[PDB]
Request: fold
Amino acid sequence: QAKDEELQRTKERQQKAEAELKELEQKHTQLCEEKNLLQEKLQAETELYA
Amino acid sequence: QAKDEELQRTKERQQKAEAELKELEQKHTQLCEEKNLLQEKLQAETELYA
Reply:
């Protein structure tokens, strides 16, 4: 009873994992952009403070 | 017997997905720490402009 109930949850993990990996793959693409633009903003802000 | 032939491969597909996620999971863990300190610095740099 526990096993074949778990088999329902087990395929849901496979469904979660592919979708979650694509969601992360999309947001690393964004977090590639975030890292450079925030660094550019941070330097220029210090130059203005001087 | 018919079940666990496929379920052994279905376990393999989960193991592949979790291991692939793990490679990313360590890296996003680091990129949480990198983001938190940068977010704190980026906010604090702007607060004195109030």
Q: What stands out?
A: The two ends of chain B are 70 Å apart (CA to CA). The first helix of chain B runs from residue 2 to 47.
